């Protein structure tokens, strides 16, 4: 029924880190997927008691969601890239896990996850 506490967007004991990459990643690839008219169910947790959705965290043990990243990036709470990639990976992957092939938000996820990959493609290499 209720909603679980949110992913943690900062830690005192985890060692912070600013990479190039990472500035990629928040002001190309965030500020794309961020903007984009698909991105508004994204860009916080999925909020199971106001959607009516009971079974959304009983199926769903790793949210993830684009606020909580940009929360992240802005926070400099990853060490590396890789961290930041894997947060959105698993925020795509929640949504084709809990909705059916057909639905909008799934086509939504979709659109986003297409431009992500394209941006992503254009990752630098560390400075
Ligand atoms: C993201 C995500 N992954 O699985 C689910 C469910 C979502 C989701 C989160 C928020 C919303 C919706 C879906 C839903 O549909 C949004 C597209 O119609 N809705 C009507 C809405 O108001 N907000």
Same mark, same amino acid.
């Given at each position: 029924?209720?909603?679980?506490?949110?992913?943690?967007?900062?830690?005192?004991?985890?060692?912070?880190?600013?990479?190039?990459?990472?500035?990629?990643?928040?002001?190309?690839?965030?500020?794309?997927?961020?903007?984009?008219?698909?991105?508004?169910?994204?860009?916080?947790?999925?909020?199971?008691?106001? #959607?009516?959705?009971?079974?959304?965290?009983?199926?769903?043990?790793?949210?993830?969601?684009?606020?909580?990243?940009?929360?992240?990036?802005?926070?400099?709470?990853?060490?590396?890239?890789?961290?930041?990639?894997?947060?959105?990976?698993?925020?795509?992957?929640?949504?084709?896990?809990?909705?059916?092939?057909?639905?909008?938000?799934?086509?939504?996820?979709?659109?986003?996850?297409?431009?992500? #990959?394209?941006?992503?493609?254009?990752?630098?290499?560390?400075?």
């Amino acid at each position: 029924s209720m909603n679980p506490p949110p992913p943690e967007t900062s830690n005192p004991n985890k060692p912070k880190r600013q990479t190039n990459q990472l500035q990629y990643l928040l002001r190309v690839v965030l500020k794309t997927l961020w903007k984009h008219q698909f991105a508004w169910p994204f860009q916080q947790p999925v909020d199971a008691v106001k #959607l009516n959705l009971p079974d959304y965290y009983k199926i769903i043990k790793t949210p993830m969601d684009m606020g909580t990243i940009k929360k992240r990036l802005e926070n400099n709470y990853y060490w590396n890239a890789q961290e930041c990639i894997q947060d959105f990976n698993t925020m795509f992957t929640n949504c084709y896990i809990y909705n059916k092939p057909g639905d909008d938000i799934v086509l939504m996820a979709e659109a986003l996850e297409k431009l992500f #990959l394209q941006k992503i493609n254009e990752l630098p290499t560390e400075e």
